[PDB]
Amino acid sequence: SAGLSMQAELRQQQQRVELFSEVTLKIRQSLQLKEILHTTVTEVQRILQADRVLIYHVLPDGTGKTISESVLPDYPTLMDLEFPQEVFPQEYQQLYAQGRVRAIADVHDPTAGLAECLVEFVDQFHIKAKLIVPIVQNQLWGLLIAHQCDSVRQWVDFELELMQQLADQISIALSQAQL
Numbered sequence: 001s002a003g004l005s006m007q008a009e010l011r012q013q014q015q016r017v018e019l020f021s022e023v024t025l026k027i028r029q030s031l032q033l034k035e036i037l038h039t040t041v042t043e044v045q046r047i048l049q050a051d052r053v054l055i056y057h058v059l060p061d062g063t064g065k066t067i068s069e070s071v072l073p074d075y076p077t078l079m080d081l082e083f084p085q086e087v088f089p090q091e092y093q094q095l096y097a098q099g100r101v102r103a104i105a106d107v108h109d110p111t112a113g114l115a116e117c118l119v120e121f122v123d124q125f126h127i128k129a130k131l132i133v134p135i136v137q138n139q140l141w142g143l144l145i146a147h148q149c150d151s152v153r154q155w156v157d158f159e160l161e162l163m164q165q166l167a168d169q170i171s172i173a174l175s176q177a178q179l
Ligand SMILES: *[C@H](C)[C@H]1/C(=C/c2[nH]c(/C=C3N=C(/C=C4\NC(=O)C(CC)=C4C)C(C)=C\3CCC(=O)O)c(CCC(=O)O)c2C)NC(=O)[C@@H]1C
Pocket: 056, 078, 083, 086, 087, 088, 089, 092, 100, 101, 102, 113, 114, 115, 117, 118, 121, 122, 125, 130, 132, 143, 145
């Protein structure tokens, strides 16, 4: 007789082929999502003519890392850098989860009210001006951030509004698609 391979090793291999098809699609989806986020920060940097645009991801214990960045070559890269909770306190992570935004024309202007240690931190990256909008899943997932490094910058309301609208679509992706 015969047919022993059909319901043994050939059907085993067939399940493995179907799972391989599915795992390669899932990895391509991870690549495509990171490409869309990368294209978004690079295009926002070009369109704003900002010196840096990045996506900062916070973990539940409030530590963080830059997951996407576009930076002009005259200024430091935040891509590889991990930071503790103290650079962005959990009390403020909660205010961002509840929709806090900031548009700071001049981080060195005392009336902007920034912690001395925070002014020192943003100085590490040659930051003069910063625009900050949250990405949520509400729990904070991260920040979409624009920096000016060459000069102080009076941010315009539409820049803040449309940065928020981009971050809100990142929030939907990270939530409704469960991506
Ligand atoms: C003190 C030793 C440390 C510290 C304290 C601190 N930070 C904030 C608030 C913020 N910190 C950040 C962090 C960033 N901004 C960026 O552009 C980047 C990427 C380069 C990061 C990581 C942000 C966005 C905020 C929120 C600012 C806001 O007012 O909404 C506070 C609270 C606010 C205040 O100014 O008192 C505090 C106390 N931050 C440091 O970096 C020090 C090491």
